[PDB]
């Protein structure tokens, strides 16, 4: 009965700023974006050597995925971010909704495909100075500063 959401979540890109709680970040990912949606996809892809350890605690206290990547490697955050992308893209048929939290605009042709190759909702969180070329392709477009202050 209800269509899947999936947020796939650049941590690095659009970080937790010190003093400033993950869990609430994620209620209000879930407040503003869940309303009629199933969660199917949770992923916040990071070093997590590099992250704020209460920030990954609290993480994992709201039961999702974790994913880490060590940062010496390329675009190996990138790529997680597109391989869990493509697998929601392969795993969901429309009426689908995804959410993404990055400004890199490496995801743009991501944003694309699911957009108009597989009739999904894009919905781009993104702190200021986000590419215009990944700003296109969503059908919503929110700042991520109204996760992180109050």
Same mark, same amino acid.
């Given at each position: 009965?209800?269509?899947?959401?999936?947020?796939?979540? /650049?941590?690095?890109? @659009?970080?937790?700023?010190?003093?400033?709680?993950?869990? &609430?970040?994620?209620?209000?990912?879930?407040?503003?974006?869940?309303?009629?949606? =199933?969660?199917?996809?949770?992923?916040?892809? @990071?070093?997590?050597?590099?992250?704020?350890?209460?920030? #990954?605690?609290?993480?994992?206290? @709201?039961?999702?995925?974790?994913?880490?990547?060590? $940062?010496?490697?390329?675009? %190996? $955050? /990138? /790529?997680? +971010?597109?391989?869990? !992308?493509?697998?929601?893209?392969? &795993?969901?048929? %429309?009426? $689908?909704?995804?959410?993404?939290?990055? &400004?890199?605009?490496?995801? $743009? +042709?991501?944003?694309? /495909?699911? =957009?108009?190759?597989?009739?999904?909702? #894009?919905?781009?969180?993104?702190?200021?100075? %986000?590419?215009?070329?990944? !700003?296109?392709?969503?059908?919503?477009?929110?700042?991520?500063?109204?996760?992180?202050?109050?």
């Amino acid at each position: 009965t209800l269509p899947p959401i999936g947020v796939f979540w /650049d941590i690095e890109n @659009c970080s937790v700023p010190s003093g400033r709680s993950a869990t &609430t970040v994620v209620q209000r990912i879930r407040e503003k974006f869940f309303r009629g949606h =199933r969660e199917a996809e949770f992923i916040c892809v @990071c070093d997590i050597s590099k992250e704020n350890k209460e920030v #990954i605690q609290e993480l994992n206290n @709201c039961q999702v995925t974790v994913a880490h990547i060590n $940062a010496t490697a390329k675009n %190996a $955050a /990138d /790529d997680k +971010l597109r391989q869990s !992308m493509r697998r929601f893209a392969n &795993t969901h048929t %429309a009426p $689908a909704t995804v959410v993404l939290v990055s &400004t890199d605009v490496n995801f $743009a +042709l991501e944003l694309s /495909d699911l =957009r108009h190759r597989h009739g999904f909702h #894009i919905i781009l969180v993104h702190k200021n100075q %986000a590419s215009e070329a990944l !700003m296109h392709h969503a059908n919503q477009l929110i700042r991520f500063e109204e996760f992180i202050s109050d």
